[PDB]
Amino acid sequence: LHCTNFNPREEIKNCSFNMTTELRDKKQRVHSLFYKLDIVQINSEYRLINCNTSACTQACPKVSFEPIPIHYCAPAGFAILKCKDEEFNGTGPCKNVSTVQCTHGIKPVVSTQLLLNGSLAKKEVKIRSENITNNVKTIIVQLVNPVIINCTRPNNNTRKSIRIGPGQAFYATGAIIGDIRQAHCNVSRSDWNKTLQQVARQLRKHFVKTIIFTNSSGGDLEVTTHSFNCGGEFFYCNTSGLFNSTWENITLPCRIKQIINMWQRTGQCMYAPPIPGVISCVSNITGLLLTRDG
């Protein structure tokens, strides 16, 4: 790739490269926009961040990542036991047990840190874990009232379809019609603060003591961010402004990637094609997953 910057965070590049066409002997000099996070410099000649470890399969633009409820059923001759006790800790005896053939409608919503679109606690924010005394065991919070997160990618993107071969059409990121803004999310203060003092008083029921909230540890982008899906593109929001209180909006600056590995697998990625137009999604925040230090 031969890339230059964009305009006189969220860095975007305008990269021109030689590309194949419908005929093997002929080439084409086409250009595309690549988010800076999907692309590394060689040492301005750049390179797609995945080419040195694995190939990438871009999504068929007709399928959707829309999470819709899945019902898991048990075969004939088996059964599923549903615990109906409200304040059920998740582990141990359950006094209100009923049997069902299938589970309820479970939406495969992939997210990080914050659990979006889920089942709430019927009363009192319930906390679940294995060995609470062990910090290496993940804690899972489940809110009782859902705070509403409001995300949107404002830039009016356009889809530019290349033709890298007979029937193979790579959809490149075209121009940005209109203003260039910053993708982000809004959640309500005095509501995240109202529901964080709820998670607070339940964290102290197991830990006697002052409790503190901080940001992620550090490392990969998927590990240290509120990575989720929104209208087709994969956001990577920075939640340092959400977990920052020791016991009007709060805006989370989000970056957007196109080369995602999803399941952290051994060399397999997907190129998320650019969604044309404006993207905006609204998601309930029903759950949480923390990690104690010691």
Added chain:
Amino acid sequence: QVQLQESGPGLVKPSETLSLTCTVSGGSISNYYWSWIRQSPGKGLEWIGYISDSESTNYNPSLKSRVIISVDTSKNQLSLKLNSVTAADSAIYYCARAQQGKRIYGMVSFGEFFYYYYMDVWGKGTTVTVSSASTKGPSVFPLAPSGTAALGCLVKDYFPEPVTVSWNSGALTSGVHTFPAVLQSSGLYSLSSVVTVPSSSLGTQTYICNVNHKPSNTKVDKKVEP
């Protein structure tokens, strides 16, 4: 409430430093932004530069390496200099009050705005001419008259622009008609003004013109009569 007025030398030799000034009236000088604009024959309005209320400079890339926009907060005087002047730098120079605007299109915290300036009150303008030719005072000759009559004065060979004509030192203003100049092949202009006036007062009320040519400091005045 706030007015402006430019000042200049009228003539500047090539490859020398041009210097102009402006006088702000009815307003503080270190309160607003000030700009400089010039219009040459054949070229549109060209924005030279601008000075801030914090007195910070920012010049057009067309002449960043030749312009110094100073200031004098003791009075209300704004400065401008032009190093190494050539023949193309001759134009009518203006000084206006730039008003800073803040257009916000996204989030003010993400930096999604852009600053834009607009100049609402301008000065009258100062004419400067770039030529190695020397200055020269005019030679106003009177034009005697003859329902109404017409009378004027022939401001002959003079260089450079401009020249001012006033009748009765500003008393007679109705019917005046100062014509544009004429650049002769000899290299210097020639102007003529006239004034239509009732035929009754041809002998009594004296008519006296007043010619001002600052680029040579040759101030003259003459009288017209049959």
Added chain:
Amino acid sequence: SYVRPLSVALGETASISCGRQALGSRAVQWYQHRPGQAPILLIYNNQDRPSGIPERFSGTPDINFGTRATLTISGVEAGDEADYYCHMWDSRSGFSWSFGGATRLTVLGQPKAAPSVTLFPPSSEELQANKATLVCLISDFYPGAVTVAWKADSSPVKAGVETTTPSKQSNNKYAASSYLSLTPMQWKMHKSYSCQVTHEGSTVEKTVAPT
């Protein structure tokens, strides 16, 4: 730079399109400028006009991107015959240094006006300096285009003429000078000199004689 010619009829509404389209959210300025005249600001925001400018000068607000910036001059008169500039600022382009190309609105359909020719003989003081210069002053005509022709008795003369180009007055009319320069000898030896001004398909002549 290079100019865009525009022509509207008297009393109509002028729709002056801006030079450079905006790539994003914009902040446009409209200046009315005349050659040899201090430019006046018509509209400084996308539609905000300052004190004194009549309501007939209106712009397009940038409520939604895509809408183009235009200056709308309703009920054009003879005074709206000037250069208009579009100072285009936006969120994507750099620092809007230049005012852009000028569009010169020329309001058509103005009534016609006849010249006011006036010819002065050489002064006594000027003739004493051994230099004679007749002066023919044309004024208050429209459209701004005339033709001068100097007569030396019967035969004409053109060697020694210096004629101004038309120039708009304060009454939206045009004027021009006309100087014939000759030696004081040929002023006295000729019977009469004339100044023939041809405006449109008509000619008017105001002569003078050495007496």
